[PDB]
Amino acid sequence: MKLSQDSSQIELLKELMDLQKDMVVMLLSMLEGNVVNGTIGKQMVDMLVESSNNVEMILKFFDMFLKLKDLTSSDTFKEYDPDGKGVISKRDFHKAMESHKHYTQSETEFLLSCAETDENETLDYEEFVKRFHEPAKDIGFNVA
């Protein structure tokens, strides 16, 4: 959450979320050959309950950045961006989100903060949904 809002700390976020993927992969390997009501499962569940709040935040992050692809693919946003130029405005993206209505006020504010716009207040949603959706789609599948 901290690095996503910042603009310079993008490669660090990529490295951190690659470390996250490798952690989840090791966790999956720890359950390889699992049995019903096993000690390893007991201990993983204990760890998850111990760190439940952090998993809550991680899951919320992944969900809000997984719904971004559906928002982009919706026809309401296609009306706002009639051509495939890949560039949309701040009002335009905000109104698209507010019509999409599946994002709360806090989620919309966080998305706007994580969205970087230049002097024209226009962002590239074709990279905004690749810098975040793809790592989310990659890690969250392993978490699931």
Short mmCIF file of N, CA, C and O in Angstrom, two decimals:
data_model
loop_
_atom_site.label_atom_id
_atom_site.label_comp_id
_atom_site.label_asym_id
_atom_site.label_seq_id
_atom_site.Cartn_x
_atom_site.Cartn_y
_atom_site.Cartn_z
N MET A 1 0.81 -1.21 0.00
CA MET A 1 0.00 0.00 0.00
C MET A 1 0.85 1.26 0.00
O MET A 1 0.48 2.25 -0.65
N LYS A 2 1.97 1.26 0.72
CA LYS A 2 2.78 2.47 0.84
C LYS A 2 3.43 2.84 -0.49
O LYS A 2 3.39 4.01 -0.91
N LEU A 3 4.04 1.87 -1.17
CA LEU A 3 4.81 2.16 -2.38
C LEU A 3 3.92 2.42 -3.58
O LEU A 3 4.32 3.16 -4.49
N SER A 4 2.72 1.83 -3.62
CA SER A 4 1.86 1.97 -4.79
C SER A 4 1.46 3.43 -5.01
O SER A 4 1.37 3.88 -6.16
N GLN A 5 1.21 4.17 -3.93
CA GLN A 5 0.84 5.57 -4.07
C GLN A 5 1.98 6.39 -4.65
O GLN A 5 1.76 7.29 -5.47
N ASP A 6 3.22 6.10 -4.24
CA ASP A 6 4.37 6.82 -4.76
C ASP A 6 4.61 6.47 -6.23
O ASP A 6 4.20 5.42 -6.72
N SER A 7 5.28 7.39 -6.93
CA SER A 7 5.55 7.24 -8.35
C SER A 7 6.94 6.70 -8.65
O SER A 7 7.09 5.95 -9.62
N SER A 8 7.95 7.07 -7.86
CA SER A 8 9.30 6.60 -8.13
C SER A 8 9.49 5.14 -7.72
O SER A 8 10.28 4.42 -8.35
N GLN A 9 8.77 4.69 -6.69
CA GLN A 9 9.00 3.37 -6.12
C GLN A 9 8.11 2.34 -6.82
O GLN A 9 7.14 1.82 -6.27
N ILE A 10 8.46 2.07 -8.07
CA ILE A 10 7.74 1.10 -8.89
C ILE A 10 8.53 -0.19 -9.05
O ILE A 10 7.98 -1.29 -8.89
N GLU A 11 9.82 -0.09 -9.36
CA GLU A 11 10.66 -1.28 -9.43
C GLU A 11 10.78 -1.95 -8.07
O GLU A 11 10.83 -3.18 -7.99
N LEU A 12 10.84 -1.16 -7.00
CA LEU A 12 10.85 -1.74 -5.66
C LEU A 12 9.56 -2.49 -5.38
O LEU A 12 9.58 -3.57 -4.77
N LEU A 13 8.42 -1.93 -5.80
CA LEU A 13 7.15 -2.64 -5.64
C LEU A 13 7.14 -3.94 -6.43
O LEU A 13 6.65 -4.96 -5.94
N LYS A 14 7.68 -3.91 -7.65
CA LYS A 14 7.76 -5.13 -8.45
C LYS A 14 8.62 -6.19 -7.77
O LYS A 14 8.24 -7.37 -7.71
N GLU A 15 9.77 -5.78 -7.23
CA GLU A 15 10.63 -6.73 -6.51
C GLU A 15 9.93 -7.28 -5.28
O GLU A 15 10.01 -8.49 -5.00
N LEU A 16 9.26 -6.42 -4.52
CA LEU A 16 8.57 -6.85 -3.31
C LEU A 16 7.46 -7.84 -3.63
O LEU A 16 7.28 -8.84 -2.93
N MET A 17 6.71 -7.59 -4.70
CA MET A 17 5.60 -8.45 -5.07
C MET A 17 6.05 -9.69 -5.82
O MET A 17 5.26 -10.63 -5.99
N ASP A 18 7.30 -9.73 -6.30
CA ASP A 18 7.91 -10.98 -6.71
C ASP A 18 8.35 -11.82 -5.52
O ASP A 18 8.19 -13.05 -5.52
N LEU A 19 8.91 -11.17 -4.50
CA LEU A 19 9.21 -11.86 -3.25
C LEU A 19 7.95 -12.44 -2.63
O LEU A 19 7.97 -13.55 -2.08
N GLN A 20 6.84 -11.70 -2.70
CA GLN A 20 5.57 -12.21 -2.21
C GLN A 20 5.15 -13.47 -2.95
O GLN A 20 4.70 -14.45 -2.34
N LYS A 21 5.28 -13.46 -4.28
CA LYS A 21 4.91 -14.63 -5.07
C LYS A 21 5.76 -15.83 -4.70
O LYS A 21 5.25 -16.95 -4.57
N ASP A 22 7.07 -15.62 -4.53
CA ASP A 22 7.93 -16.73 -4.13
C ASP A 22 7.61 -17.23 -2.73
O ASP A 22 7.69 -18.44 -2.48
N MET A 23 7.25 -16.34 -1.81
CA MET A 23 6.79 -16.77 -0.49
C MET A 23 5.55 -17.65 -0.59
O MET A 23 5.48 -18.71 0.05
N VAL A 24 4.56 -17.23 -1.38
CA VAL A 24 3.36 -18.05 -1.56
C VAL A 24 3.67 -19.38 -2.23
O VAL A 24 3.07 -20.40 -1.85
N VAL A 25 4.59 -19.41 -3.18
CA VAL A 25 5.02 -20.65 -3.82
C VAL A 25 5.66 -21.59 -2.81
O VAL A 25 5.38 -22.79 -2.83
N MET A 26 6.51 -21.07 -1.93
CA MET A 26 7.07 -21.91 -0.88
C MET A 26 5.98 -22.42 0.05
O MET A 26 6.01 -23.58 0.49
N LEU A 27 5.01 -21.57 0.38
CA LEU A 27 3.89 -22.00 1.21
C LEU A 27 3.09 -23.10 0.53
O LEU A 27 2.67 -24.06 1.18
N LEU A 28 2.86 -22.98 -0.79
CA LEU A 28 2.19 -24.04 -1.52
C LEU A 28 3.00 -25.33 -1.50
O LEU A 28 2.43 -26.42 -1.31
N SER A 29 4.31 -25.24 -1.70
CA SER A 29 5.17 -26.42 -1.64
C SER A 29 5.17 -27.07 -0.27
O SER A 29 5.33 -28.29 -0.17
N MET A 30 4.99 -26.29 0.80
CA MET A 30 4.88 -26.84 2.14
C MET A 30 3.64 -27.70 2.32
O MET A 30 3.61 -28.54 3.23
N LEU A 31 2.61 -27.53 1.49
CA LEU A 31 1.40 -28.34 1.54
C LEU A 31 1.37 -29.40 0.45
O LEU A 31 0.31 -29.97 0.18
N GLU A 32 2.50 -29.66 -0.19
CA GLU A 32 2.57 -30.66 -1.25
C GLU A 32 2.53 -32.05 -0.62
O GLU A 32 3.30 -32.34 0.30
N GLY A 33 1.64 -32.90 -1.11
CA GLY A 33 1.41 -34.18 -0.47
C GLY A 33 0.67 -34.08 0.84
O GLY A 33 0.90 -34.88 1.74
N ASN A 34 -0.23 -33.10 0.96
CA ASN A 34 -0.94 -32.87 2.21
C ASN A 34 -1.94 -33.98 2.49
O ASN A 34 -2.36 -34.72 1.60
N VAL A 35 -2.33 -34.08 3.76
CA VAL A 35 -3.33 -35.03 4.21
C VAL A 35 -4.41 -34.26 4.97
O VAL A 35 -4.20 -33.13 5.42
N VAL A 36 -5.57 -34.89 5.10
CA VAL A 36 -6.68 -34.26 5.81
C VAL A 36 -6.35 -34.21 7.30
O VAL A 36 -5.95 -35.22 7.90
N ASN A 37 -6.51 -33.03 7.89
CA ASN A 37 -6.19 -32.79 9.30
C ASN A 37 -4.73 -33.12 9.59
O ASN A 37 -4.40 -33.96 10.43
N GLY A 38 -3.84 -32.43 8.87
CA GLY A 38 -2.42 -32.60 9.03
C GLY A 38 -1.80 -31.50 9.87
O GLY A 38 -2.34 -30.41 10.01
N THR A 39 -0.63 -31.82 10.44
CA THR A 39 0.06 -30.86 11.30
C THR A 39 0.49 -29.62 10.53
O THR A 39 0.41 -28.50 11.05
N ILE A 40 0.96 -29.80 9.30
CA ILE A 40 1.37 -28.66 8.48
C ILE A 40 0.18 -27.75 8.21
O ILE A 40 0.29 -26.52 8.26
N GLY A 41 -0.98 -28.34 7.90
CA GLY A 41 -2.18 -27.54 7.72
C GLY A 41 -2.59 -26.82 8.99
O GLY A 41 -2.98 -25.65 8.95
N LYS A 42 -2.53 -27.51 10.13
CA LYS A 42 -2.79 -26.88 11.42
C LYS A 42 -1.93 -25.64 11.60
O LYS A 42 -2.42 -24.57 11.96
N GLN A 43 -0.63 -25.79 11.36
CA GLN A 43 0.30 -24.69 11.61
C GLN A 43 0.13 -23.55 10.61
O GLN A 43 0.25 -22.38 10.98
N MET A 44 -0.15 -23.87 9.34
CA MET A 44 -0.43 -22.81 8.37
C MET A 44 -1.69 -22.04 8.75
O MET A 44 -1.73 -20.81 8.63
N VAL A 45 -2.73 -22.74 9.20
CA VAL A 45 -3.95 -22.06 9.63
C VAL A 45 -3.67 -21.20 10.85
O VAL A 45 -4.19 -20.08 10.97
N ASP A 46 -2.86 -21.70 11.78
CA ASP A 46 -2.49 -20.90 12.95
C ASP A 46 -1.76 -19.63 12.54
O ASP A 46 -2.04 -18.55 13.06
N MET A 47 -0.82 -19.75 11.60
CA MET A 47 -0.09 -18.58 11.12
C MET A 47 -1.03 -17.59 10.44
O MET A 47 -0.91 -16.37 10.63
N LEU A 48 -1.96 -18.09 9.63
CA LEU A 48 -2.90 -17.21 8.94
C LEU A 48 -3.80 -16.48 9.93
O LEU A 48 -4.06 -15.28 9.77
N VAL A 49 -4.27 -17.18 10.96
CA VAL A 49 -5.09 -16.53 11.99
C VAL A 49 -4.26 -15.50 12.75
O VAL A 49 -4.76 -14.43 13.11
N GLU A 50 -2.99 -15.81 13.00
CA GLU A 50 -2.11 -14.86 13.68
C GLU A 50 -1.94 -13.59 12.86
O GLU A 50 -1.94 -12.48 13.41
N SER A 51 -1.79 -13.72 11.54
CA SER A 51 -1.59 -12.58 10.66
C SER A 51 -2.83 -12.24 9.85
O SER A 51 -2.72 -11.77 8.71
N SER A 52 -4.02 -12.46 10.42
CA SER A 52 -5.27 -12.28 9.67
C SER A 52 -5.46 -10.86 9.16
O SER A 52 -5.95 -10.69 8.04
N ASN A 53 -5.10 -9.84 9.94
CA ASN A 53 -5.30 -8.46 9.50
C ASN A 53 -4.47 -8.15 8.26
O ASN A 53 -4.97 -7.51 7.32
N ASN A 54 -3.21 -8.58 8.25
CA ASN A 54 -2.35 -8.34 7.09
C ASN A 54 -2.89 -9.05 5.86
O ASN A 54 -2.85 -8.50 4.75
N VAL A 55 -3.39 -10.27 6.03
CA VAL A 55 -4.00 -10.97 4.90
C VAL A 55 -5.26 -10.26 4.46
O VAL A 55 -5.58 -10.23 3.27
N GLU A 56 -6.01 -9.68 5.40
CA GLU A 56 -7.17 -8.87 5.03
C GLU A 56 -6.76 -7.73 4.11
O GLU A 56 -7.38 -7.51 3.06
N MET A 57 -5.72 -6.99 4.50
CA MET A 57 -5.27 -5.87 3.67
C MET A 57 -4.76 -6.34 2.31
O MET A 57 -5.07 -5.72 1.29
N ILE A 58 -4.00 -7.44 2.28
CA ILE A 58 -3.48 -7.96 1.02
C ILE A 58 -4.61 -8.38 0.10
O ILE A 58 -4.61 -8.08 -1.10
N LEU A 59 -5.61 -9.08 0.65
CA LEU A 59 -6.74 -9.53 -0.14
C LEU A 59 -7.57 -8.36 -0.65
O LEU A 59 -8.05 -8.39 -1.79
N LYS A 60 -7.76 -7.32 0.17
CA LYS A 60 -8.46 -6.13 -0.30
C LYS A 60 -7.72 -5.48 -1.45
O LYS A 60 -8.33 -5.07 -2.45
N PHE A 61 -6.39 -5.36 -1.32
CA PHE A 61 -5.57 -4.81 -2.40
C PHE A 61 -5.75 -5.60 -3.69
O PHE A 61 -6.01 -5.04 -4.76
N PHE A 62 -5.64 -6.93 -3.59
CA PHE A 62 -5.76 -7.78 -4.77
C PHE A 62 -7.15 -7.68 -5.39
O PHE A 62 -7.28 -7.64 -6.61
N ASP A 63 -8.20 -7.64 -4.56
CA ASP A 63 -9.55 -7.55 -5.10
C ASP A 63 -9.78 -6.22 -5.82
O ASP A 63 -10.34 -6.19 -6.93
N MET A 64 -9.37 -5.11 -5.20
CA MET A 64 -9.59 -3.82 -5.83
C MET A 64 -8.77 -3.65 -7.09
O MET A 64 -9.19 -2.91 -7.99
N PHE A 65 -7.62 -4.31 -7.20
CA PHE A 65 -6.86 -4.23 -8.44
C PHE A 65 -7.20 -5.34 -9.43
O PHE A 65 -6.73 -5.29 -10.57
N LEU A 66 -7.99 -6.33 -9.03
CA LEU A 66 -8.53 -7.30 -9.97
C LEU A 66 -9.82 -6.81 -10.62
O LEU A 66 -10.08 -7.16 -11.77
N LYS A 67 -10.62 -6.03 -9.90
CA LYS A 67 -11.80 -5.41 -10.49
C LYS A 67 -11.45 -4.31 -11.48
O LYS A 67 -12.32 -3.88 -12.25
N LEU A 68 -10.19 -3.86 -11.49
CA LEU A 68 -9.78 -2.79 -12.40
C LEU A 68 -9.87 -3.23 -13.86
O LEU A 68 -10.24 -2.44 -14.73
N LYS A 69 -9.53 -4.49 -14.14
CA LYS A 69 -9.62 -4.98 -15.51
C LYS A 69 -11.06 -5.00 -16.00
O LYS A 69 -11.34 -4.62 -17.14
N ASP A 70 -11.99 -5.42 -15.14
CA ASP A 70 -13.41 -5.40 -15.51
C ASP A 70 -13.90 -3.97 -15.71
O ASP A 70 -14.66 -3.69 -16.64
N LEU A 71 -13.46 -3.04 -14.85
CA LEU A 71 -13.79 -1.63 -15.05
C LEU A 71 -13.29 -1.13 -16.40
O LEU A 71 -14.01 -0.42 -17.11
N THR A 72 -12.05 -1.47 -16.75
CA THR A 72 -11.51 -1.03 -18.03
C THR A 72 -12.29 -1.63 -19.20
O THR A 72 -12.60 -0.94 -20.17
N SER A 73 -12.63 -2.91 -19.10
CA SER A 73 -13.34 -3.60 -20.17
C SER A 73 -14.82 -3.26 -20.25
O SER A 73 -15.47 -3.64 -21.23
N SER A 74 -15.36 -2.57 -19.25
CA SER A 74 -16.76 -2.19 -19.29
C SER A 74 -17.02 -1.18 -20.40
O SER A 74 -16.13 -0.43 -20.82
N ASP A 75 -18.26 -1.17 -20.89
CA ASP A 75 -18.61 -0.30 -22.01
C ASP A 75 -18.72 1.16 -21.59
O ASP A 75 -18.56 2.05 -22.42
N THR A 76 -18.99 1.42 -20.31
CA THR A 76 -19.06 2.80 -19.84
C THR A 76 -17.71 3.49 -20.00
O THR A 76 -17.65 4.65 -20.45
N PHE A 77 -16.62 2.81 -19.66
CA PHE A 77 -15.30 3.38 -19.87
C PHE A 77 -14.96 3.45 -21.35
O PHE A 77 -14.23 4.36 -21.78
N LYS A 78 -15.46 2.51 -22.15
CA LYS A 78 -15.24 2.57 -23.59
C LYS A 78 -15.91 3.79 -24.22
O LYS A 78 -15.40 4.35 -25.19
N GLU A 79 -17.07 4.20 -23.68
CA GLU A 79 -17.69 5.43 -24.14
C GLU A 79 -16.83 6.64 -23.80
O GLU A 79 -16.73 7.59 -24.59
N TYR A 80 -16.21 6.63 -22.62
CA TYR A 80 -15.35 7.74 -22.22
C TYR A 80 -14.10 7.79 -23.08
O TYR A 80 -13.60 8.88 -23.38
N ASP A 81 -13.57 6.64 -23.46
CA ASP A 81 -12.43 6.56 -24.36
C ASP A 81 -12.87 5.91 -25.67
O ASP A 81 -12.64 4.71 -25.88
N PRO A 82 -13.52 6.66 -26.56
CA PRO A 82 -14.07 6.04 -27.79
C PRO A 82 -13.01 5.41 -28.67
O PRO A 82 -13.27 4.39 -29.32
N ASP A 83 -11.81 5.99 -28.72
CA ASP A 83 -10.72 5.45 -29.52
C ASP A 83 -9.73 4.69 -28.64
O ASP A 83 -9.65 4.91 -27.43
N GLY A 84 -8.99 3.79 -29.27
CA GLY A 84 -8.01 3.00 -28.56
C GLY A 84 -6.68 3.70 -28.40
O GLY A 84 -5.62 3.10 -28.58
N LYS A 85 -6.72 5.00 -28.06
CA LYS A 85 -5.49 5.76 -27.88
C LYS A 85 -4.77 5.37 -26.60
O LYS A 85 -3.54 5.53 -26.51
N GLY A 86 -5.49 4.85 -25.61
CA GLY A 86 -4.89 4.44 -24.36
C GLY A 86 -4.75 5.53 -23.32
O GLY A 86 -4.11 5.29 -22.28
N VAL A 87 -5.32 6.71 -23.55
CA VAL A 87 -5.15 7.86 -22.65
C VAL A 87 -6.53 8.38 -22.25
O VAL A 87 -7.39 8.57 -23.11
N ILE A 88 -6.73 8.59 -20.95
CA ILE A 88 -8.00 9.07 -20.41
C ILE A 88 -7.73 10.11 -19.32
O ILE A 88 -6.65 10.15 -18.73
N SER A 89 -8.74 10.95 -19.07
CA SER A 89 -8.64 12.10 -18.18
C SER A 89 -9.05 11.74 -16.75
O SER A 89 -9.44 10.61 -16.45
N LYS A 90 -8.94 12.73 -15.86
CA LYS A 90 -9.08 12.46 -14.42
C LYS A 90 -10.55 12.43 -14.00
O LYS A 90 -11.00 11.46 -13.40
N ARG A 91 -11.29 13.51 -14.28
CA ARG A 91 -12.75 13.46 -14.45
C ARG A 91 -13.24 12.24 -15.20
O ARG A 91 -14.17 11.58 -14.74
N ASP A 92 -12.65 11.89 -16.33
CA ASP A 92 -13.19 10.78 -17.08
C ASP A 92 -13.03 9.46 -16.32
O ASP A 92 -13.99 8.70 -16.18
N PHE A 93 -11.84 9.22 -15.77
CA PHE A 93 -11.61 8.00 -15.00
C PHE A 93 -12.43 7.99 -13.72
O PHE A 93 -12.99 6.95 -13.33
N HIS A 94 -12.50 9.13 -13.03
CA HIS A 94 -13.27 9.24 -11.80
C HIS A 94 -14.75 8.99 -12.05
O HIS A 94 -15.40 8.27 -11.29
N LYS A 95 -15.30 9.59 -13.10
CA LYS A 95 -16.70 9.36 -13.43
C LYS A 95 -16.93 7.92 -13.86
O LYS A 95 -17.98 7.34 -13.54
N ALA A 96 -15.98 7.32 -14.57
CA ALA A 96 -16.09 5.91 -14.91
C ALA A 96 -16.17 5.05 -13.65
O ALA A 96 -17.03 4.17 -13.54
N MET A 97 -15.31 5.33 -12.67
CA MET A 97 -15.35 4.59 -11.42
C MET A 97 -16.65 4.82 -10.66
O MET A 97 -17.24 3.87 -10.13
N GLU A 98 -17.11 6.07 -10.59
CA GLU A 98 -18.32 6.40 -9.84
C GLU A 98 -19.56 5.82 -10.50
O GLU A 98 -20.55 5.55 -9.81
N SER A 99 -19.55 5.66 -11.82
CA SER A 99 -20.64 4.94 -12.48
C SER A 99 -20.50 3.43 -12.31
O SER A 99 -21.51 2.73 -12.26
N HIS A 100 -19.27 2.94 -12.24
CA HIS A 100 -19.05 1.51 -12.03
C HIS A 100 -19.57 1.10 -10.66
O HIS A 100 -20.11 0.00 -10.49
N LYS A 101 -19.43 1.98 -9.67
CA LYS A 101 -20.11 1.92 -8.37
C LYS A 101 -19.69 0.74 -7.52
O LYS A 101 -20.11 0.65 -6.35
N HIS A 102 -18.88 -0.17 -8.04
CA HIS A 102 -18.36 -1.27 -7.25
C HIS A 102 -17.16 -0.86 -6.41
O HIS A 102 -16.67 -1.68 -5.62
N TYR A 103 -16.70 0.37 -6.55
CA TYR A 103 -15.62 0.91 -5.73
C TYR A 103 -16.20 1.92 -4.74
O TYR A 103 -16.95 2.82 -5.14
N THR A 104 -15.86 1.76 -3.47
CA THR A 104 -16.30 2.71 -2.46
C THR A 104 -15.51 4.01 -2.58
O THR A 104 -14.64 4.16 -3.44
N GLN A 105 -15.82 4.96 -1.70
CA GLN A 105 -15.10 6.23 -1.71
C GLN A 105 -13.63 6.05 -1.37
O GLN A 105 -12.76 6.63 -2.03
N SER A 106 -13.33 5.24 -0.35
CA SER A 106 -11.94 5.01 0.02
C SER A 106 -11.18 4.30 -1.09
O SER A 106 -10.04 4.64 -1.39
N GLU A 107 -11.81 3.30 -1.71
CA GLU A 107 -11.16 2.58 -2.80
C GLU A 107 -10.93 3.49 -4.00
O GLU A 107 -9.87 3.43 -4.64
N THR A 108 -11.90 4.34 -4.32
CA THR A 108 -11.72 5.29 -5.42
C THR A 108 -10.59 6.27 -5.13
O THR A 108 -9.78 6.57 -6.01
N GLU A 109 -10.53 6.77 -3.89
CA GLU A 109 -9.46 7.68 -3.52
C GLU A 109 -8.10 7.00 -3.61
O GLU A 109 -7.12 7.60 -4.08
N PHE A 110 -8.01 5.75 -3.15
CA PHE A 110 -6.75 5.02 -3.23
C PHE A 110 -6.35 4.78 -4.68
O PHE A 110 -5.16 4.89 -5.02
N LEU A 111 -7.31 4.44 -5.54
CA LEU A 111 -7.01 4.24 -6.95
C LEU A 111 -6.51 5.53 -7.58
O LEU A 111 -5.55 5.52 -8.36
N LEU A 112 -7.14 6.66 -7.25
CA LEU A 112 -6.69 7.95 -7.77
C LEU A 112 -5.28 8.27 -7.28
O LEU A 112 -4.45 8.78 -8.05
N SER A 113 -5.00 7.99 -6.01
CA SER A 113 -3.66 8.24 -5.47
C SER A 113 -2.62 7.39 -6.18
O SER A 113 -1.53 7.87 -6.51
N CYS A 114 -2.92 6.12 -6.42
CA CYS A 114 -2.02 5.22 -7.12
C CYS A 114 -1.93 5.53 -8.61
O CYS A 114 -1.00 5.04 -9.28
N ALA A 115 -2.86 6.31 -9.15
CA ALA A 115 -2.83 6.71 -10.55
C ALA A 115 -1.96 7.95 -10.71
O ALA A 115 -2.18 8.95 -10.03
N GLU A 116 -0.98 7.87 -11.61
CA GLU A 116 -0.07 8.98 -11.86
C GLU A 116 -0.47 9.67 -13.16
O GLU A 116 -0.60 9.02 -14.20
N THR A 117 -0.65 10.98 -13.09
CA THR A 117 -1.01 11.78 -14.25
C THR A 117 0.00 12.90 -14.46
O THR A 117 0.59 13.43 -13.51
N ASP A 118 0.21 13.26 -15.73
CA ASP A 118 1.16 14.29 -16.10
C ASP A 118 0.49 15.66 -16.04
O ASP A 118 -0.59 15.82 -15.47
N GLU A 119 1.14 16.67 -16.62
CA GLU A 119 0.61 18.03 -16.60
C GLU A 119 -0.74 18.15 -17.29
O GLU A 119 -1.47 19.12 -17.05
N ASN A 120 -1.09 17.19 -18.15
CA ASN A 120 -2.38 17.18 -18.82
C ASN A 120 -3.45 16.43 -18.03
O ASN A 120 -4.58 16.31 -18.50
N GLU A 121 -3.10 15.94 -16.84
CA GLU A 121 -4.03 15.21 -15.97
C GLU A 121 -4.66 14.03 -16.71
O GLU A 121 -5.83 13.69 -16.51
N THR A 122 -3.87 13.39 -17.57
CA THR A 122 -4.30 12.24 -18.35
C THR A 122 -3.34 11.09 -18.11
O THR A 122 -2.12 11.25 -18.25
N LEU A 123 -3.88 9.93 -17.74
CA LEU A 123 -3.09 8.76 -17.40
C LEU A 123 -3.26 7.68 -18.46
O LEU A 123 -4.27 7.64 -19.17
N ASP A 124 -2.26 6.81 -18.55
CA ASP A 124 -2.30 5.68 -19.48
C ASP A 124 -2.89 4.48 -18.75
O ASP A 124 -2.20 3.77 -18.02
N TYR A 125 -4.19 4.25 -18.95
CA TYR A 125 -4.84 3.11 -18.33
C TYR A 125 -4.41 1.78 -18.94
O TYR A 125 -4.74 0.73 -18.37
N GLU A 126 -3.69 1.78 -20.06
CA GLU A 126 -3.15 0.55 -20.61
C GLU A 126 -1.93 0.05 -19.86
O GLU A 126 -1.64 -1.15 -19.91
N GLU A 127 -1.21 0.93 -19.17
CA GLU A 127 -0.17 0.52 -18.24
C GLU A 127 -0.63 0.55 -16.79
O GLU A 127 -0.04 -0.14 -15.95
N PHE A 128 -1.67 1.33 -16.49
CA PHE A 128 -2.22 1.34 -15.14
C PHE A 128 -2.85 0.00 -14.79
O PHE A 128 -2.91 -0.37 -13.61
N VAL A 129 -3.33 -0.74 -15.79
CA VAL A 129 -3.92 -2.06 -15.57
C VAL A 129 -2.93 -3.18 -15.89
O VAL A 129 -3.32 -4.35 -15.92
N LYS A 130 -1.67 -2.84 -16.15
CA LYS A 130 -0.62 -3.84 -16.27
C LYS A 130 0.37 -3.79 -15.12
O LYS A 130 0.91 -4.83 -14.74
N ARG A 131 0.62 -2.60 -14.56
CA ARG A 131 1.49 -2.47 -13.41
C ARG A 131 0.88 -3.08 -12.15
O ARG A 131 1.62 -3.48 -11.24
N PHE A 132 -0.44 -3.17 -12.09
CA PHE A 132 -1.13 -3.62 -10.89
C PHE A 132 -1.95 -4.89 -11.09
O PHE A 132 -1.88 -5.80 -10.26
N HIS A 133 -2.73 -4.97 -12.17
CA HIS A 133 -3.60 -6.12 -12.37
C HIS A 133 -2.80 -7.40 -12.59
O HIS A 133 -3.10 -8.44 -12.00
N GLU A 134 -1.78 -7.34 -13.44
CA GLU A 134 -0.99 -8.54 -13.73
C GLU A 134 -0.31 -9.11 -12.49
O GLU A 134 -0.44 -10.32 -12.24
N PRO A 135 0.42 -8.33 -11.67
CA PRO A 135 0.94 -8.91 -10.43
C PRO A 135 -0.15 -9.41 -9.50
O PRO A 135 0.03 -10.43 -8.83
N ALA A 136 -1.28 -8.71 -9.45
CA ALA A 136 -2.39 -9.17 -8.62
C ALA A 136 -2.97 -10.47 -9.15
O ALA A 136 -3.18 -11.42 -8.40
N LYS A 137 -3.23 -10.52 -10.46
CA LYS A 137 -3.72 -11.75 -11.07
C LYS A 137 -2.74 -12.91 -10.89
O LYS A 137 -3.17 -14.07 -10.83
N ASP A 138 -1.45 -12.61 -10.76
CA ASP A 138 -0.45 -13.66 -10.61
C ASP A 138 -0.36 -14.16 -9.17
O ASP A 138 -0.33 -15.37 -8.94
N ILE A 139 -0.33 -13.25 -8.20
CA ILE A 139 -0.17 -13.66 -6.81
C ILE A 139 -1.48 -14.19 -6.24
O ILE A 139 -1.49 -15.21 -5.53
N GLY A 140 -2.59 -13.50 -6.50
CA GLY A 140 -3.85 -13.89 -5.90
C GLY A 140 -4.31 -15.27 -6.30
O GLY A 140 -5.00 -15.94 -5.54
N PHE A 141 -3.96 -15.72 -7.51
CA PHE A 141 -4.30 -17.08 -7.90
C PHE A 141 -3.60 -18.09 -7.00
O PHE A 141 -4.21 -19.08 -6.57
N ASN A 142 -2.32 -17.87 -6.72
CA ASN A 142 -1.60 -18.75 -5.81
C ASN A 142 -2.16 -18.67 -4.40
O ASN A 142 -2.26 -19.70 -3.71
N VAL A 143 -2.54 -17.47 -3.95
CA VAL A 143 -3.14 -17.34 -2.63
C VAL A 143 -4.46 -18.10 -2.55
O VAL A 143 -4.74 -18.79 -1.57
N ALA A 144 -5.29 -18.00 -3.60
CA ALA A 144 -6.54 -18.74 -3.67
C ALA A 144 -6.32 -20.24 -3.73
O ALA A 144 -7.09 -20.99 -3.12
#
